[PDB]
């Protein structure tokens, strides 16, 4: 009956390039209650409004969450040509989306902090000709191809990652670089919401209130 956002509230949230995705169908949600547990610093949406996304029925609701430093807010926009939207995370274009930047309050101890913030700064294929470099831009609703060679938490800023590819996998090399951001006093996160309307299967509805 009710949509469960519990996995979000427990454990250490991953970095942006390893965003955790929750998919909701056939359930009732209370978005306002979820956001009341956090300090929402920023709440912007595309092809929908913050008020409307908390009060509409959908055929599916996708929620992506990850550790994200509040300072790099503008980098988390596709309008910007930053490494975040190029190599890490990229929301859908043909579907209404929302982006929430929140800070974990001290009374929410169930959410633990990672060692630091970190993201993919570079991600490219180095071909077998030892010359041509092919940048691997992340697609919507997909992970970076370099998530296989980039660790879940980057050790040092500007670290280098290199993996040799078999002929079957196009040969050459898979090459990536990662950046780090020092951990804030309180854990800061990002939330990516994507909704999709249908015809009859619009069963992801806001939890209404009764006597």
């Amino acid at each position, epitope marked *: 009956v009710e949509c469960d956002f519990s996995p979000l509230l427990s454990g250490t949230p991953p970095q942006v390039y390893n965003f955790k995705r929750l998919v909701f169908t056939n359930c009732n949600y209370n978005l306002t209650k979820l956001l009341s547990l956090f300090s929402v610093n920023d709440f912007t949406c595309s092809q929908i409004s913050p008020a409307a996304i908390a009060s509409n029925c959908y055929s599916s609701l996708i929620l992506d969450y990850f550790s994200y430093p509040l300072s790099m807010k503008s980098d988390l926009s596709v309008s910007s040509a930053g490494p975040i939207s190029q190599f890490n995370y990229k929301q859908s274009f043909s579907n209404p989306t929302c982006l929430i930047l929140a800070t974990v309050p001290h009374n929410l101890t169930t959410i633990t902090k990672p060692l630091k913030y970190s993201y993919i*700064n*570079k991600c*490219s294929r*180095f071909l077998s000709d*030892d010359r041509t*470099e092919v940048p691997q831009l992340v697609n919507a609703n997909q992970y970076s191809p370099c998530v296989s060679i980039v*660790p879940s938490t980057v*050790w*040092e800023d*500007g*670290d*280098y*990652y*290199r993996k040799q590819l078999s002929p079957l996998e196009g040969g050459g*090399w898979l*090459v990536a*670089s990662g950046s780090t951001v020092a951990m804030t006093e309180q854990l800061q996160m990002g939330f990516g919401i994507t909704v999709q309307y249908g015809t009859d299967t619009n069963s992801v509805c806001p939890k209404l209130e009764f006597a």
Partner: antibody
Amino acid sequence: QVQLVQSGAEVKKPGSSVKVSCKASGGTFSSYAISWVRQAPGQGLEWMGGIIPIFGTASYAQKFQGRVTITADKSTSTAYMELSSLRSEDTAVYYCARVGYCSSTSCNRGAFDIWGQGTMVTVSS
Amino acid sequence: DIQLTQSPSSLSASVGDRVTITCRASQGIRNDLGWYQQKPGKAPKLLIYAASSLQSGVPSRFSGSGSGTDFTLTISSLQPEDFATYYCQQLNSYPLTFGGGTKVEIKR
């Protein structure tokens, strides 16, 4: 079996700058990082910094930050180490070296398998 | 910064006997240690990477072991060409730190 060929010896006045080259010979940099190491007469080895040629990403020892610049020309596979405000304590042999084996944390850190012949730099009045 | 204490600073030895050089890190570095050899007037040479892995071509008389903090370079039966200076190096974190070095001279 790529080789690393460095530029010739350098004689500099105190306060000036020096720029040593490190070119890949009989091969290429490929996907490998290039570090720099110096050694003063009678002293041990010391890491100064390194660079990822493909990305131009450079890392430095905090000791030399502000006086050192490490670049790389990918079109010729030639790395460079520029050291400015030269002091007499900078009189040393400077080596370039390839990071052939990735450590457990990254690939711009690791064992240096191939070394250049070194470049002697003397700083004196 | 990771500090590497290489001991002993120097040792005298004859051709054919066992020689042990220890390197100790100020903190855990897993297996991210390298061993180098250097002759007077020449560039250092990689002997062992990943604490125990022998570099291609380097004689099997060189043996590295250890994991975490305490590492050891063992040379089982010294040859004339083995008399040189040996350096420890940690590969774990910045800055890349070398050990103080061990001078192996010939005992006569």
